[PDB]
Amino acid sequence: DRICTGITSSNSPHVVKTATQGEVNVTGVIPLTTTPTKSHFANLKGTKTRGKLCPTCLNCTDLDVALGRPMCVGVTPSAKASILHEVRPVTSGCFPIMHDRTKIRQLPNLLRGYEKIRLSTQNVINAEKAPGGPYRLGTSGSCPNATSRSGFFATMAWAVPKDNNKTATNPLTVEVPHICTKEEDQITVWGFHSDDKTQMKNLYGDSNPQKFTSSANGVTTHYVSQIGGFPDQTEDGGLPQSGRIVVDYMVQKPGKTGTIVYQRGILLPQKVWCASGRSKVIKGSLPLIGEADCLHEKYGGLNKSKPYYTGEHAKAIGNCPIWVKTPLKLANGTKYRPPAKLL
Amino acid sequence: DRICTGITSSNSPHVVKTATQGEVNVTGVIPLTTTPTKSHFANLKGTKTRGKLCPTCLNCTDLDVALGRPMCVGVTPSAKASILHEVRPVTSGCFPIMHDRTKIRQLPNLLRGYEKIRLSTQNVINAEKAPGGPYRLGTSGSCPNATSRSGFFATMAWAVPKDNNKTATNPLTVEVPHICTKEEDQITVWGFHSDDKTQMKNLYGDSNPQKFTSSANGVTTHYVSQIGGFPDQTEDGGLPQSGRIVVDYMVQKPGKTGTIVYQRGILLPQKVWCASGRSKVIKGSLPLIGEADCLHEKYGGLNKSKPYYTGEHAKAIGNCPIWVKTPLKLANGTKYRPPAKLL
Amino acid sequence: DRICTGITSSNSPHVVKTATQGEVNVTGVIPLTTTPTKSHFANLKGTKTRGKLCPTCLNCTDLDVALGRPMCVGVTPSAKASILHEVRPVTSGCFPIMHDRTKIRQLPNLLRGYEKIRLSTQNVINAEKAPGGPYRLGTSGSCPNATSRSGFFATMAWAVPKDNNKTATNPLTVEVPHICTKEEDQITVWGFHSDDKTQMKNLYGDSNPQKFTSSANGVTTHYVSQIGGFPDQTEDGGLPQSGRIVVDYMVQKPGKTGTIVYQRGILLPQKVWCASGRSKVIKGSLPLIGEADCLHEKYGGLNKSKPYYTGEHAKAIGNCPIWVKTPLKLANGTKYRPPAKLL
Amino acid sequence: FFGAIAGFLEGGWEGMIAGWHGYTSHGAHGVAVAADLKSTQEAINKITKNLNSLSELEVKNLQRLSGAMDELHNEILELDEKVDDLRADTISSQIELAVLLSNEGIINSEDEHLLALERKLKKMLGPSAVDIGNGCFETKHKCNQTCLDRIAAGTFNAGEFSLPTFDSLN
Amino acid sequence: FFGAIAGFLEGGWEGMIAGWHGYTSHGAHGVAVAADLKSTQEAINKITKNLNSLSELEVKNLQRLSGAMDELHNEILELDEKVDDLRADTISSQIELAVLLSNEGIINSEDEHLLALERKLKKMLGPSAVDIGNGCFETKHKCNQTCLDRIAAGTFNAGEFSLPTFDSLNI
Amino acid sequence: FFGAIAGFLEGGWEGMIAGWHGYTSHGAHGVAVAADLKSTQEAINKITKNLNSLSELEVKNLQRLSGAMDELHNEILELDEKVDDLRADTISSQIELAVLLSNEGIINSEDEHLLALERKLKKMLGPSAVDIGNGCFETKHKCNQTCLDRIAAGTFNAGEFSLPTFDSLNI
Ligand SMILES: *[C@@H]1O[C@H](CO)[C@@H](O[C@@H]2O[C@H](CO)[C@@H](O)[C@H](O)[C@H]2NC(C)=O)[C@H](O)[C@H]1NC(C)=O
Ligand SMILES: *[C@@H]1O[C@H](CO)[C@@H](O[C@@H]2O[C@H](CO)[C@@H](O)[C@H](O)[C@H]2NC(C)=O)[C@H](O)[C@H]1NC(C)=O
Ligand SMILES: *[C@@H]1O[C@H](CO)[C@@H](O[C@@H]2O[C@H](CO)[C@@H](O)[C@H](O)[C@H]2NC(C)=O)[C@H](O)[C@H]1NC(C)=O
Numbered sequence A, B, C: 001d002r003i004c005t006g007i008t009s010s011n012s013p014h015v016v017k018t019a020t021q022g023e024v025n026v027t028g029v030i031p032l033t034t035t036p037t038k039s040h041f042a043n044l045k046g047t048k049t050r051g052k053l054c055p056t057c058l059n060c061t062d063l064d065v066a067l068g069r070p071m072c073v074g075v076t077p078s079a080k081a082s083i084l085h086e087v088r089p090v091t092s093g094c095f096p097i098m099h100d101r102t103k104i105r106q107l108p109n110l111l112r113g114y115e116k117i118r119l120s121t122q123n124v125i126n127a128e129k130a131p132g133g134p135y136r137l138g139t140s141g142s143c144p145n146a147t148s149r150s151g152f153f154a155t156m157a158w159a160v161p162k163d164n165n166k167t168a169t170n171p172l173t174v175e176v177p178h179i180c181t182k183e184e185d186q187i188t189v190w191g192f193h194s195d196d197k198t199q200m201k202n203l204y205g206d207s208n209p210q211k212f213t214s215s216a217n218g219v220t221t222h223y224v225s226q227i228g229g230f231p232d233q234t235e236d237g238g239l240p241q242s243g244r245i246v247v248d249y250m251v252q253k254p255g256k257t258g259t260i261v262y263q264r265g266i267l268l269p270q271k272v273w274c275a276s277g278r279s280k281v282i283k284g285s286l287p288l289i290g291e292a293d294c295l296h297e298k299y300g301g302l303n304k305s306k307p308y309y310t311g312e313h314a315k316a317i318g319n320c321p322i323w324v325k326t327p328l329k330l331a332n333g334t335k336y337r338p339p340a341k342l343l
Numbered sequence D: 001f002f003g004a005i006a007g008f009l010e011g012g013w014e015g016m017i018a019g020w021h022g023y024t025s026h027g028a029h030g031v032a033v034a035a036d037l038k039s040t041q042e043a044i045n046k047i048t049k050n051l052n053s054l055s056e057l058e059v060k061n062l063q064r065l066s067g068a069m070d071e072l073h074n075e076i077l078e079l080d081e082k083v084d085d086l087r088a089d090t091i092s093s094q095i096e097l098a099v100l101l102s103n104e105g106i107i108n109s110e111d112e113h114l115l116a117l118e119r120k121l122k123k124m125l126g127p128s129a130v131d132i133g134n135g136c137f138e139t140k141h142k143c144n145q146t147c148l149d150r151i152a153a154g155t156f157n158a159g160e161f162s163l164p165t166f167d168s169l170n
Numbered sequence E, F: 001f002f003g004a005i006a007g008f009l010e011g012g013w014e015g016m017i018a019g020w021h022g023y024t025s026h027g028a029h030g031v032a033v034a035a036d037l038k039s040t041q042e043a044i045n046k047i048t049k050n051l052n053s054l055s056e057l058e059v060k061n062l063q064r065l066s067g068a069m070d071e072l073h074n075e076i077l078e079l080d081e082k083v084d085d086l087r088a089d090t091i092s093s094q095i096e097l098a099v100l101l102s103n104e105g106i107i108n109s110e111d112e113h114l115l116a117l118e119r120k121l122k123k124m125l126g127p128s129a130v131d132i133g134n135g136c137f138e139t140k141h142k143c144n145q146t147c148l149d150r151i152a153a154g155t156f157n158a159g160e161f162s163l164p165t166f167d168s169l170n171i
């Protein structure tokens, strides 16, 4: 008899690429990729995941918290991963702000990029004794408290001249010292109040536009105020007001003093943010539901099965599959062979 | 007799690299690379390719078009690929500009980076009714039309006080609304005119330097004007003038209002640019001659033969060969063998 | 007898990874990686290596040299590699500066990024004839010389009004021309002096805060001065002063004029920096001791033995080993085999 | 390509169900087929190890810049988007390459399994069988399905047909 | 390395013109040389497929940033230039690796073609020929150029020399 | 995998000291072991060339941006740090792949060295020895350590045992 070596023949619908034989049909494969499905976002397995800056602070927005709105002062937990859920963060109370006139909306998004964030317990500047005559610390019914009808942002002080016969002033300069640790960045919040002609005279003794300039870390910004004819109030406390505030922030690296040059209507910094480390940030939505190996901007939370994935590439954090252009497969069979017969 | 297997012997001047045998000589190879030659630029096969912003506008520069110079207002076609032919775009008419005092020269290069660009049909601001007394809309013989001796940039309005007994003014604020679609960026053009002491008094009722500030998307810019002693007129309409304008632009993302704080001599924005999408931009020269698979900054238009290329790497768009460090070759023969002989 | 092919058996403590057999034990390996040890920095073999900007200038800091301090004007050799040893460069003499109010500290670090740096031999502006009445060029005992008790920074001119009956002035404008070659960037140094009320009146005829604005390459900066109440003198010449200067710089690309708008106390630019090319910059420390193949931010100077290295990845210049995640090995032996025996 | 040049059978046997490669016998019984489980397991383990190796690759996460804010730093964010895209592109190509080499390896080794199975068959058949060179041996005895199955199991003894055998070293 | 250790002929035959590998015959005729076209075609096709595979690689274009303007954003543009440069560098290295492995594969397979050609020769010569082990067979008959040409063509029959032959299975 | 399937000896010989692969002889002398120096040198040279190839790779230095200053351009410097990190990561992976394939090659070629050594042995033993197929040959004569040493040296002559030999072609 004759005895020979041979290879099986079976249905071979699967195709893989080779270098020397081109595409070939094989009896079996191991898929290396899947296309994920869009799911809700979730907590990152093995990593505390930040959503709202202060989750215990109810009816508060991240921006409200960042500005130190009354009722919105609380604990801001540390996190090595964060979800950016507001590309344009809004306020939901206190005194009316002309937001788009500065970079202020992005303040809470800057904070979430740090691992640890805390609001200072002491004031960085003594507002009452600040340059430009003694000031009383202004308040407003627009900013209520559980135990008060009136108040103001914890991060700022509405410095208004105490003295009768208050009058116009030359631009004054304050230094803003760095009061955080050597390991922390300081984010200083400041701004200015403006109003209509009469109200300006009452409050400040000048009805002309006021000028403001900040300088920190090599960055200079310049602002000129507006007298009357303001755009409508929005994202505020609901009370009609004749004036508006403009709010800004400046970042000070450890050991770096910042300065503010101001006139009337100045909102001097008080409690400042102290921030250290880095948090992994990606875009997503709230709420966080469950655990996942990986957080993905286009698919939300997902668990890692296959090593690779196909679909839309985007930013993604955690234990994630690696994006590929095509659905790769590993050969797990033999190359196709026509069935052999005798006659 | 004896019968044996054997391998041919032939001239083997070609060399390829191996992992286990080092460089070896082979009888034949397939070259995988060429060195391209420098050619003129051309149209990108399969993609509309932009050169001038408004090709139908003759005797106009891209900057002239972007500023809305009289005679230079026309159709600006969409394109997914563009050629940057002016690193420092010049004007060629209208009122004399002190270009280098702002970022204005780069305006047309910014526009070309978008796929679709259009000039608004409506004015973004009513200049006559704008803050600071009623204004008449200024004009100049420097900016002629085929049907007029005088005019001005379509994008701006030379706001000069109507009223006799015109005088100095406090800094006024205008909001510049976003009037494009939700899918479009708005590029707002504005500026200011200045002159010598007497002409300033006549036009505005103030011979002192004027101050200007813009704020959009978190960016603030500050300008102070100059009274007399101007640098020579250039890139303008040829007519002698005693004054000069300074021109700037600010980019407004959809739904973002911009502000301008101004005094006398203000050139308020009128027609604005509305722009969406992205165009593939590389440096090149005009004119575009013919079709090519690939546009390459150092070689111009070229067609793809080999998969790779050697020479100078630079930015390149289209169906292009991939740059490599060395002229790679694929073995297409056998390793060199000394000719075998009997005795 | 029976004769067979065989493979040796020996101690096989070494492990390498394979694709088809997983991790395997082998009789011998060639290590491809080492972990470097931390050493002092050194000169880059084959490349002139910059440490101090002007090594011949003793008791001068790089910032002192860059500002053109008396005694600190000398030769600044060219170099294709540089060591950044001061993340926050300090001064060590001359008139007291409020450094953190601008980006000025980084000036010498900007210069070291160029290959060639030179101080202009001619003044870019005639300070005595500059706008705002004729000026005398001020000097100070804080800036002594080997042959003088008094002087000032070579890069600036303390412009103080000559005439009696000196007074306040409107914002004046100077153009700062580009006086370097077409191949060179120009770094222009300027600033302003301020003091207390009385001294201001004496020097300038105005005790009010003064305003300053620079414009170059599309960048605008705005400053307002301070009258009295200055922070303590530091990094200066040791002499008590009642005033302070603020110093800044602006970069001008070839053929680009810069602008400065100023009032009283202006320190007009004089000698400017002309800089071309690029130097390879990494963080390191002084002094440079010996030669090395490679300079590495975390390990200092090191010589290349193995092709790869393990440890902490960081910026590194020269003939360097390539960083890898694990200590890779190349098999130089046979896979492990159990000793074979007869009975 | 080896089998093609060497004249190995280019067809396959549907009867071979319990494995990927093995043996056929041709005689008066017609044609028997038996899969060799050792050779099949070897291939499967190689592929399994290969799968593990490809699954061990780790790359850095791509997340947002912590300092670059929307609107304020659009230019920076465009470059950041570019870096992400080029990363995804480059690693993708590298992975496709690794996979391709893997598959090239698996398909190529097929003829090597046959060559190995031929050595195993040669020893079991004993010195009375003749080697044709195309993976086939001519025998003095009949080998039906029962005989072929014992070959696949390595239990075949030529002594049962009164034929010479090779003894194994102790 | 295989042929070197196995004692395969390290030289080559200039007479082999119509192909890359084949057969030689050594006897009273002197020495005949015939190229095997099957083996040569196999090698050529592998290389061709290999060329296609290398040509299928696609990478993203590198173009300008749409938002970064000259002068205004020089710092950003420096980083952009750095990104372009590192990309060109990395992909270049990856391609060189791909080409290296291709060439390693092609050169290495030469001895495998010989090994395969040896199997083809063994069957055609029949069971009366003797296998030496160095890629050579000893025959009972003379094989001149005409005989070798039929071997290279696969038409050679040992029966014509009154020698035993292997029959092929009907499949 | 080849040896496993082909029934090659899965064990090794501690006696084989002067090299990596070679021969054993089994008879009344017990068991002799001789390393083949040609095969060992071939393997060593392949590895050496492989080492050179891996050491030829060059990548661009990663240094600081010349224009981006600390504090002033922190955002840019963060992205720059990201670029460096991703570069180090990607090239690392590519290098690990290069090294993996190298090692895969070296380990795999072991059975090929045996296959080659078997061809060399087959010719030297002459046509009176029988091929078992598991890398072993049965001989008519005794082969002690002295005999094996001449086999490993390629000097072995079957004529000394009054056995037929293959003659070598004059080339
Ligand atoms: C090899 O693979 C291809 C793809 O799976 C198979 O062809 C496909 O299957 C049927 C034909 O039987 C069609 O409905 C599909 O449209 C085919 N696709 C393509 C792209 O041709 C093929 O049958 C497989 N088997 C063999 C032996 O080639
Ligand atoms: C990813 O895997 C986790 C772990 O299995 C999934 O959540 C768990 O399974 C069920 C969810 O219904 C719960 O009883 C467990 O207690 C969960 N464990 C946790 C949350 O640690 C999770 O749903 C998966 N996510 C996917 C598939 O998107
Ligand atoms: C790879 O493919 C083979 C296909 O033969 C798989 O091995 C199979 O799984 C069973 C386990 O029950 C084994 O006993 C057999 O050898 C195979 N089955 C059949 C019906 O042939 C192996 O599981 C695959 N590996 C994967 C999918 O990871």
Ligand SMILES: *[C@@H]1O[C@H](CO)[C@@H](O[C@@H]2O[C@H](CO)[C@@H](O)[C@H](O)[C@H]2NC(C)=O)[C@H](O)[C@H]1NC(C)=O
Residues within 6 Å of the ligand: B011, B012, B013, B014, B015, B025, B336
């Ligand atoms: C192997 O290839 C190299 C490169 O072509 C050959 O080296 C050249 O040989 C020619 C002719 O002798 C010289 O004139 C050149 O100067 C050589 N070096 C080059 C161009 O780099 C070498 O001759 C070839 N070896 C062969 C064919 O055996």
Ligand SMILES: *[C@@H]1O[C@H](CO)[C@@H](O[C@@H]2O[C@H](CO)[C@@H](O)[C@H](O)[C@H]2NC(C)=O)[C@H](O)[C@H]1NC(C)=O
Residues within 6 Å of the ligand: B039, B290, B291, B292, B293, B301, B302, B303
């Ligand atoms: C790239 O290829 C195109 C197409 O072949 C070349 O242009 C064509 O060929 C001739 C040359 O002018 C014309 O008659 C055709 O009408 C052209 N076709 C098109 C669609 O334009 C082109 O010149 C090539 N460019 C190179 C080689 O740089």
Ligand SMILES: *[C@@H]1O[C@H](CO)[C@@H](O[C@@H]2O[C@H](CO)[C@@H](O)[C@H](O)[C@H]2NC(C)=O)[C@H](O)[C@H]1NC(C)=O
Residues within 6 Å of the ligand: B028, B030, B332, B333, E044
């Ligand atoms: C690789 O080399 C072979 C020759 O070694 C090329 O094949 C040639 O093309 C003809 C078609 O007329 C074939 O019949 C011959 O084999 C060869 N003859 C000549 C004159 O070249 C093959 O084309 C090459 N592959 C390439 C260049 O991609």
Ligand SMILES: *[C@@H]1O[C@H](CO)[C@@H](O[C@@H]2O[C@H](CO)[C@@H](O)[C@H](O)[C@H]2NC(C)=O)[C@H](O)[C@H]1NC(C)=O
Residues within 6 Å of the ligand: C011, C012, C013, C014, C015, C025, C336
């Ligand atoms: C294969 O390699 C491993 C690792 O070198 C050898 O085992 C190591 O020896 C140390 C000695 O204390 C012990 O920790 C273990 O025996 C091994 N270490 C680890 C971390 O597992 C192993 O013996 C080798 N296998 C052999 C020689 O057959």
Ligand SMILES: *[C@@H]1O[C@H](CO)[C@@H](O[C@@H]2O[C@H](CO)[C@@H](O)[C@H](O)[C@H]2NC(C)=O)[C@H](O)[C@H]1NC(C)=O
Residues within 6 Å of the ligand: C039, C290, C291, C292, C293, C301, C302, C303
């Ligand atoms: C790198 O290599 C250089 C050159 O070998 C080492 O310095 C040399 O050796 C001694 C100092 O130890 C001197 O006598 C030589 O003159 C030096 N050569 C040169 C050119 O300076 C250097 O120390 C090594 N660096 C290391 C090991 O970190």
Ligand SMILES: *[C@@H]1O[C@H](CO)[C@@H](O[C@@H]2O[C@H](CO)[C@@H](O)[C@H](O)[C@H]2NC(C)=O)[C@H](O)[C@H]1NC(C)=O
Residues within 6 Å of the ligand: C028, C030, C332, F018, F019, F040, F044
């Ligand atoms: C790889 O291993 C071999 C040993 O197996 C090393 O070579 C031996 O050691 C020295 C260095 O050449 C020589 O004196 C011996 O004769 C060598 N033994 C041999 C050739 O059998 C070789 O150096 C190693 N390669 C390295 C470390 O790169």
Ligand SMILES: *[C@@H]1O[C@H](CO)[C@@H](O)[C@H](O)[C@H]1NC(C)=O
Residues within 6 Å of the ligand: A058, A059
């Ligand atoms: C405040 O929160 C409570 C509880 O969620 C809710 O019922 C109430 O309507 C909220 N008031 C607001 C959002 O003004």
Ligand SMILES: *[C@@H]1O[C@H](CO)[C@@H](O)[C@H](O)[C@H]1NC(C)=O
Residues within 6 Å of the ligand: A070, A071, A145, A146, A147, A148, A150, A151, A152
């Ligand atoms: C309410 O605001 C007052 C000041 O307006 C403050 O003293 C008090 O602590 C606040 N109550 C809180 C935060 O619960």
Ligand SMILES: *[C@@H]1O[C@H](CO)[C@@H](O)[C@H](O)[C@H]1NC(C)=O
Residues within 6 Å of the ligand: A165, A166, A167
């Ligand atoms: C009171 O008001 C005016 C100036 O606004 C003037 O009579 C006098 O200087 C002021 N007195 C002060 C400020 O003490």
Ligand SMILES: *[C@@H]1O[C@H](CO)[C@@H](O)[C@H](O)[C@H]1NC(C)=O
Residues within 6 Å of the ligand: B058, B059
């Ligand atoms: C462009 O200007 C030149 C200037 O002399 C003129 O001849 C030409 O007619 C102009 N182009 C037109 C009218 O399209």
Ligand SMILES: *[C@@H]1O[C@H](CO)[C@@H](O)[C@H](O)[C@H]1NC(C)=O
Residues within 6 Å of the ligand: B070, B071, B145, B146, B147, B148, B150, B151, B152
């Ligand atoms: C032609 O020029 C005039 C100039 O004032 C202007 O109206 C416009 O550009 C054209 N006139 C039209 C459209 O009526």
Ligand SMILES: *[C@@H]1O[C@H](CO)[C@@H](O)[C@H](O)[C@H]1NC(C)=O
Residues within 6 Å of the ligand: B165, B166, B167
């Ligand atoms: C006339 O007087 C001054 C002089 O410029 C001017 O400012 C004022 O507006 C004029 N008076 C009226 C009533 O318009």
Ligand SMILES: *[C@@H]1O[C@H](CO)[C@@H](O)[C@H](O)[C@H]1NC(C)=O
Residues within 6 Å of the ligand: C057, C058, C059
């Ligand atoms: C630097 O100062 C020291 C003393 O502090 C002195 O010995 C040395 O001469 C000085 N070098 C100079 C002025 O170049």
Ligand SMILES: *[C@@H]1O[C@H](CO)[C@@H](O)[C@H](O)[C@H]1NC(C)=O
Residues within 6 Å of the ligand: C070, C071, C145, C146, C147, C148, C150, C151, C152
């Ligand atoms: C000392 O300073 C004076 C100007 O105050 C200058 O003219 C002189 O050249 C300087 N001398 C040296 C040695 O630097």
Ligand SMILES: *[C@@H]1O[C@H](CO)[C@@H](O)[C@H](O)[C@H]1NC(C)=O
Residues within 6 Å of the ligand: C164, C165, C166, C167
């Ligand atoms: C003299 O002093 C007066 C009062 O300050 C001033 O207005 C005038 O311009 C001065 N004369 C000059 C500077 O010639």
Ligand SMILES: *[C@@H]1O[C@H](CO)[C@@H](O)[C@H](O)[C@H]1NC(C)=O
Residues within 6 Å of the ligand: D144, D145, D146, D147
């Ligand atoms: C194979 O042949 C033997 C010998 O006669 C017999 O005993 C056995 O049953 C046969 N098996 C088959 C499947 O025919």
